[model samples]
Target: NTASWFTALTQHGKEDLKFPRGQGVPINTNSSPDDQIGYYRRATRRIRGDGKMKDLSPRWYFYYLGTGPEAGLPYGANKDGIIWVATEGALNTPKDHIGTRNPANNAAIVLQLPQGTTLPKGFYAE
Candidate 1:
């Protein structure tokens, strides 16, 4: 689900999914469809805003990173390690002892893939 979601962001013609609002520039999803870095960075900030999640958690898309498919991110043919995005000052209370708790660092919205799992087609990590 997470890979699909992220892949969608990477695919063309899907970036139109704008966030509706933001602190600076709007997440013009209509633009670069494969702009993965921009997607996560903008997503991080938007996640902290009221225009944040339309529903609970905005996403239960949290998962652990064992020595599996997710351990290799960025989707590059030759890449490794997981990537995390932190949404600061968003949740009412950040989970304790899990990720960056203080607003300074940010909140944790974990994403990963374990062994025997292959990323969604058209999606890979660096």
Candidate 2:
């Protein structure tokens, strides 16, 4: 079931929706080659398409688990490596307050990984 892709969260605009779902991204598929150089965690998913939201426009999705050094061990990439999605916009809701916080309209559909050879470490703010 891939856990119902993490269950529903109706934002009905259609990039296909899924929120907090049954949870996944806990990949530990039997590492051995130098312990596979570890670290493969950090995941999130929330979607609402046609409601039209772009410019958070930085995105990363690299899955090349077949190279040297055991592969698949890069996170959030950047610094010329690649991977993007931090235009730093639209985050903070609970009905927002204080001059209503910049131009946001519901966003949080991340699940990025090593946009580079391997980078990104700690404190991911939105």
Candidate 3:
């Protein structure tokens, strides 16, 4: 799924707006032609890989539908190097509690934090 969302997240916007999973930039798929169900699937995959949530978690899914304009809209890129785990609310406002707030986000195969915990560092340290 990450592959698909990465493709849609890349194709839906100008090259400058879509970024790789790192580099502290985010790609906004909700505000453009990228908002497909497959993109959501990719987003879920992306988040899973990043360890934001697990396949079994009930809330571990993308709500891109009601998430409003692309978070970075016009800009469409993001900070923190993650793709779609930035926003927590349906309207995509500044995220409230995030992955770190949930135990599921601690997705460790055996050891180690999911790394999603680091995603919010730039936002919070500010």
Which model scores highest in TM-score?
1
Candidate structures ordered by TM-score, highest first: 1, 2, 3
lDDT of 2: 0.24
Q: What number of clashing residue pairs does each candidate have, in the order they appear? A: 14, 11, 4
* Deviation of model 2 at 36, angstroms: 2.6
- lDDT per residue for candidate 2 within 11-85, as digits (tens), equals 223132111211212122332222212112223344565876433322222222222121333433323422212
TM-score of 2: 0.19
What TM-score does candidate 1 reach? 0.21
lDDT of 3 by residue, 1-126 (tens): 111112122122211222123222224423332332110222223235677765521111232322322333322344332234322222323321221112334321121112353422112110
List ranges where model 3 is wrong by over 4 Å.
1-75, 78-89, 101-105, 108-126
Candidates in descending lDDT order: 3, 1, 2
